[PDB]
Amino acid sequence: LRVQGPREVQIHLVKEVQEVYRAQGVSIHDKHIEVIVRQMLRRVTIIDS
């Protein structure tokens, strides 16, 4: 997230979760993971208030 951007961290999280879920033959659509990934990136830190 710090180096590349907010897009690459979302891609990485979705891909890493799907790799674990696809290894056991379980089909889950990405829109279910995307809600959880969205809920994890809703806040920012304050350094120059």
Contact residues for other proteins (CB under 8 A)? 10, 18, 20-24, 26-39
Is 4 or 21 the residue whose CB approaches other proteins more closely? 21
Measuring CA to CA, how many Å separate 19 from each of 9, 16, 22, 37? 15, 5, 5, 15
The two tokens of residue 22 are 């696809």
The two tokens of residue 45 are 């830190």
Is 2 or 42 the residue whose CB approaches other proteins more closely? 42
Is 1 or 36 the residue whose CB approaches other proteins more closely? 36
Closest approach, Cβ 1 to other proteins, in A, equals 14
User: Length of the chain, please?
Assistant: 49
